[model samples]
Target: SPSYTVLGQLPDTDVYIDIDAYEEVKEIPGIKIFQINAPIYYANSDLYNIHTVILDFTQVNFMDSVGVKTLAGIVKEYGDVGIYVYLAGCSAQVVNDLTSNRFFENPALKELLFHSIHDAVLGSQVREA
Candidate 1:
């Protein structure tokens, strides 16, 4: 289910980020924290026009300060591009942490809206202008 990719074209120009992961760290040995921020970094760097970020956290559990900072950094870059970033499908705990964090308080990030994953994917067509 996590491996499935949905590709759709929007009528207008928009950008979207889909965050899908279960746990940041695994219970088994030899497992490490999933550096989800890497993709975010790439997306922001390469896809400058991306305006929306959909965080599908149906299975996600642990998002540390590093993760939060990574998101903040991405938002910072988006500010330069005048892009609007949106988040969707985040756990309550994660959402709370993000909202309370200064990183999320940044004007660039605060300006972006948040919603459930289902709402984000079904609501609009994300593309770059």
Candidate 2:
């Protein structure tokens, strides 16, 4: 399993954010960041009260048809409930792969794209109240 980084806010600071890393699975109330390290194949694929996830895609350059479908299923699955998944820093070719597979045909899925992990973090709707 991939390590998860949960983002939190500093109670008394506006200059920085708190980042908690977990090597195992645990559900915490915060934005989760997943670092994808390889080409997405048929393999590879959740938490509650965690509303947003930023799949760091900077290192990934390729994805197969099965990967696309798998990704879509995860996104759609989360969408069915309330969580949202964001794709960050996808290379042009990787994006082309997704586009060719008609990933964006569903406009809502298109909204999952983000320029970077930071953008996704800033774009998240999960805020402490």
Candidate 3:
């Protein structure tokens, strides 16, 4: 799991979520942040008390067709409970793969894309506030 630290002006409770393969970090009451350290080919999951979540893809080097579907499923399922999901730090190759797979057909998913983790964190907090 990644290290945790308090951020933003609000003193929110934050923690990390250790799951099957992925390790999430920096969880706050309003939003949570996670970093992907491996390829996203197989399906994985997470859920807790938060309205927004950001998955940092800086360390992710590869992704397959199933990976795209898995992320889509994550968005839909998480959205069902009114929680929004965001993607950040995706490489050019990763972005192309997702686009080629038509992953951005839905406006909602398209809107979730961010250029960097910093932007995603601010975006997440903005939505929460």
Candidate 4:
């Protein structure tokens, strides 16, 4: 399972999904189901005040369409609110999937951003425009 924590107080809100894969499962075939579910669960939670979601995929080795769908669904739900979703520390395969599958095409989920974990966490801030 993965764990997460908020960094600072916010006028709006932010959800940080920190994924730490097990060493043994740090490979494609060994990926855990929970890693894909964590974001979905949070998305469905009542804490919709979240303005940003930071996904830390540091050790993830593989992710399928289902996982992508889960994330896409969440982003769609919050797209109207100008919510931004950040994908960090993703594996090459994960990156390929996100870019090729039109993961950032939805108008509601239009502000998708990708970065490393360190940069994502440090740069996560509410933007007013």
Question: Taking the tens digit of each residue's C-alpha lDDT, what string does model 2 give over 36-82?
Answer: 65544422433325778678777777877887887887788877777
> Can you list the residue pairs that collide in candidate 3?
none
Flag the better candidate by TM-score, 3 or 4: 3
Worst 10 residues of 2 by lDDT: 9-18
Candidate 2 — which pairs collide?
A: none
Q: Residue 61 in candidate 1 has what lDDT?
A: 55
Candidates in order have lDDT scores of 0.45, 0.66, 0.66, 0.48
Name the runs in model 2 displaced over 4 angstroms.
1-29, 41-48, 126-129
The candidate 4 region of ten consecutive residues with least summed lDDT is 25-34
- Error at 39, model 1, angstroms: 9.6
- The best-first sequence of candidates by TM-score reads 2, 3, 4, 1
* Model 4 stretches astray by more than 4 angstroms: 1-49, 106-111, 126-128
- lDDT by residue (tens digit), candidate 4, 1-129: 233332222223333232232222221121111223344444335334445565556555665576677667765665556655566667778767766667756543334444554455445443553
Predicted structure with the largest TM-score when compared to the true one: 2
Q: Give each model a TM-score.
A: 0.48, 0.70, 0.70, 0.52
Every model's Cα RMSD, please?
Answer: 11.3, 5.6, 6.4, 10.2
* Candidate 1 lDDT by residue in tens digits, 20-56: 3222312212111112333343433443434444444
RMSD in Å for model 1: 11.3
| Tens-digit lDDT track of model 3 for 23-96 | 33334567766666544532163222688877877767767888888888788888889888888778898888
- Model number with the top lDDT: 2
lDDT of 3 at 76: 86
Quote model 4's TM-score.
Answer: 0.52
